[PDB]
Design a protein around this ligand. Structure first.
Ligand SMILES: *[C@@H]1O[C@H](CO)[C@@H](O)[C@H](O)[C@H]1NC(C)=O
Ligand SMILES: *[C@@H]1O[C@H](CO)[C@@H](O)[C@H](O)[C@H]1NC(C)=O
Ligand SMILES: *[C@@H]1O[C@H](CO)[C@@H](O)[C@H](O)[C@H]1NC(C)=O
Ligand SMILES: *[C@@H]1O[C@H](CO)[C@@H](O)[C@H](O)[C@H]1NC(C)=O
Lengths: 475, 29, 476
């Protein structure tokens, strides 16, 4: 209505436009199909012609040895020393690297009763109980422990545990024959014993047509109870930004965003010095603080990341080594998460300005006055939800793999509401107290707790309309 | 002249239904 | 008033954190993968290279014979003087497995007199009255001789079709694959599973010394009198050598702390019920207390009776060439787990007694307690209608659909229909008429009428509660 709110609206629209451009300029198409073709080539390909097993359905160590000498070498090396082009467009950078992590024999306390029959025990993976000694023909780097600081590694947080960056590693070759010979000699002298706990394969490609590196990491975990758990990660990155004019445009937009964030920071700091000290009793101020801190964190991450390109320069100095691009991919994932969260919050900040008439004002007031009761009832709702989740975890937590973990129990309970749970497995997991849980949960969610939310909303909306009508009609 | 019944067959519903109906009508009345 | 409420809340919070620690300890890190690998090794493997059938989809008796000398022997014995067997190079096979058969006698079934010319043998359904107790075939060893339940150290099972006794004709297999294969071939040649058989059990156990966790495996196959085969399985992880590491001592300390807490609660309950409030049951916050106390006392008793009866482990450890009996321990472990889960659920529900610190939370509790009566009154009618539909579906579709075969299955199918988890093909092909009528009328009268009446009642109660508190507060 007056000039200050108009200025605020104009500034907010400019900031939103800047964010929209910045987010659109980093999530274009042709990035999905890149990773899609890579995944189809490496994951879905059967390990050999005579077997229908692939990487996604590995089941034993012999299957892993078949995959390593099979679909991996077919998907890495393509014929036109010579360089390898994956799809005649994707260039394999340097050499791939394989690395295993293992524990030491005697990391247990075998019970005295059975000490006469079982002699070997290997604990589950832990930093305090991992092997650091040579084994086999202790000549190369595949039979000698190398510390984390000497490998430039970092943690991974796999499915079972969080694995260290150290281990026993081997750098493969640039040609298929040498890599095949290396893997054959690594398999003949048994490299994966009963102590092996994890295995990693890492490499990267370039695809010079577009400007996008791709980093590939494949992990295989061997639990202490026997078996194989495979997982994968394909991640595209951009490290040579300033190649075209659009990149300069994006850099200018980034500088403008930095200026906007500085202006918002100085405004917020100038507000709470004496004026309305402890002004945190408003929603639109806490939202601004959250947006500011998230943007500052994102800016700091971007500055600390883009200034770390020494690995690329080192690889470009000598193109016969292993390119180490895992940290860049990790920080890119973190930056993407932060950017998505902050863009979501700046988008939902738009409700501060949609009050142009009486209908929008009435709806906004109703939503504002529903917050307290909805939170008060959500406390009870989540208490009941957590009690049910704990019961389901304790009952089905070893057979149904929808309740195999507490957070998995919560997600399964949320999916039950949508009615996409089989109920066939939880029937046979426990014939009594299994169906009881399901029926009682359905009855108490659909009949007692949804209607309570609806009743609260109805009453609050009616009261707000009555109060607003009385206020408006008594001038 | 009295014989302990054996756990033969599985179950009979006629007697149970009659007794349940009698108890229910007694409670309502 | 609130000063003692603070002490009560502190004691309840200590009890809750102790119980949470105990439940986290009892449900340890991922032992899901243990049972996952065991099951997928024994349940999903096809019985042979050519056949695509496995244990979960057995169809006839010949399929069972193929599985026995087949996927079972492949998954039992692994090569690495008559050496033991490590199933995944990690899990040690304890002793030997055992197979057992339950059968009925010929003549326990009276066919009509006018039909006693074309048929002469009828085998009744399984019952302890009609169970066979006589030698048959080449009567040489324990496979052709009846052994009592008390001579087998067995117990009932409560399978799917019926409840099976702990007796029968049993055979202990060997430690090597060749001996077991020869024994199974000898059983198959001199026919062992005839028309009189009614149930077959296979039992064994493994250790997996890396973690400290035994596993007991039991596979059951039921042959109903009407024909067919029904398979079922039971994998149970146990811990019988508890005191090994420091965390075990920590868990023992938490256990005795829990026992002291339960004793304290019992003493408080008795002291308060003795002196005043001899009625004591018009609160709903005291029935919860007695329920929790009873459940915890039963759990403590089960734990005491279960952990002290580990004599079977001692007998096995002095002779490792015999079948170890671990079924009773698995049964009591399952019972203890169920009771502990129910107890922890009720302890969590008990937290509602203390969430009252402002006017917003007080009015919600008041609304719930006030509308509980009306909700119960309407829920009586709701459940009467629900059971009417359930019995109609059981009587009409109960013999064709595989989902209305039992009354409880009808109830669960209706509850799934509420969620939209139903497939219309089977319910329709079972009956051209009265099929669509049932489904349509059920959905309409359940979503358009019964679901909205609950909302009507709840909204009216909440509105009146809020209005009367607001009027009282604004006019005082
Ligand atoms: C493993 O540890 C046990 C513990 O005493 C030892 O006896 C054995 O020699 C070690 N090595 C192997 C290969 O078992
Ligand atoms: C780790 O980084 C340093 C930095 O130059 C490099 O010299 C070294 O070779 C790297 N480690 C490996 C195993 O290549
Ligand atoms: C079963 O018993 C009948 C007599 O009721 C007899 O005729 C028949 O041969 C028996 N069948 C056997 C033993 O297989
Ligand atoms: C039953 O247990 C006793 C020990 O209480 C044992 O001697 C006997 O052999 C067991 N039964 C069988 C069939 O092994």
């Amino acid at each position: 209505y007056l000039k200050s709110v108009l200025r605020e609206l104009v500034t907010y629209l400019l900031f939103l436009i800047v964010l929209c451009i910045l987010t659109y300029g980093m999530m274009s198409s042709n990035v999905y199909y890149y990773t899609r073709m890579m995944s189809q080539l490496f994951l879905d390909t059967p390990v050999s012609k005579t077997e229908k097993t692939n990487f996604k359905t590995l089941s034993s160590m012999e299957d892993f040895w078949k995959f390593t000498e099979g679909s991996l070498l077919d998907g890495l090396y393509w014929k036109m020393d010579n360089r390898s082009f994956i799809f005649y467009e994707n260039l394999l950078l340097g050499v791939p690297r394989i690395r295993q992590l293992r524990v030491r024999n005697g990391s247990c306390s075998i019970p005295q009763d059975l000490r006469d029959e079982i002699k070997e025990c290997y604990d589950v993976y832990s930093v305090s109980s991992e092997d650091r000694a040579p084994f086999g023909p202790r000549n190369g780097t595949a039979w000698i422990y190398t510390s984390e600081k000497d490998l430039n590694g970092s943690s991974h947080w796999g499915i079972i545990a969080t694995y260290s960056g150290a281990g026993y590693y081997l750098d493969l070759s640039r040609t298929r024959e040498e890599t095949a010979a290396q893997v054959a000699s690594l398999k003949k002298n048994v490299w994966l014993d009963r102590g092996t706990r994890a295995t990693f394969i890492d490499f990267s490609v370039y695809n010079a047509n577009i400007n996008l590196f791709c980093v590939v990491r494949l992990l295989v975990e061997f639990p202490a109870t026997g078996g194989v758990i495979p997982s994968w990660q394909f991640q595209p990155l951009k490290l040579i930004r300033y190649v075209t004019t659009f990149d300069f445009f994006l850099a200018a937009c980034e500088i403008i965003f930095c200026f906007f964030i500085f202006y918002y920071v100085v405004e917020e700091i100038l507000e709470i010095r004496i004026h309305k000290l402890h002004y945190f009793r408003s929603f639109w101020n806490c939202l601004d603080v959250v947006i500011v801190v998230l943007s500052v964190v994102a800016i700091g991450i971007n500055i600390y990341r883009t200034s770390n390109v020494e690995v690329l320069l080192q690889f470009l100095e000598d193109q016969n080594t292993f390119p180490n691009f895992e940290h860049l991919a990790y920080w890119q994932i973190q930056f993407n998460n932060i950017a998505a969260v902050t863009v979501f919050f700046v988008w939902i900040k738009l409700f501060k300005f949609i009050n142009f008439n009486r209908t929008m004002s009435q709806l906004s007031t109703t939503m504002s006055r529903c917050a307290k009761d909805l939170f008060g009832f959500a406390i009870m709702f989540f208490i009941i939800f957590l009690a049910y989740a704990q019961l389901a975890y304790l009952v089905f937590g070893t057979q149904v793999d929808d309740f195999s973990t507490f957070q998995e129990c919560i997600f399964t309970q949320f999916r039950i509401i949508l009615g996409d749970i089989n109920f066939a497995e939880i029937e046979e997991a426990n014939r009594v107290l299994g169906p009881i849980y399901f029926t009682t949960f359905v009855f108490f969610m659909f009949f007692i707790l949804l209607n309570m939310f609806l009743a609260i909303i109805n009453d609050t909306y009616s009261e707000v309309k009555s109060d607003l009508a009385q206020q408006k009609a008594e001038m | 002249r009295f014989v302990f019944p054996e756990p033969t067959a599985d179950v009979n519903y006629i007697v149970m239904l009659t007794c349940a109906v009698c108890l229910v009508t007694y409670m309502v009345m």
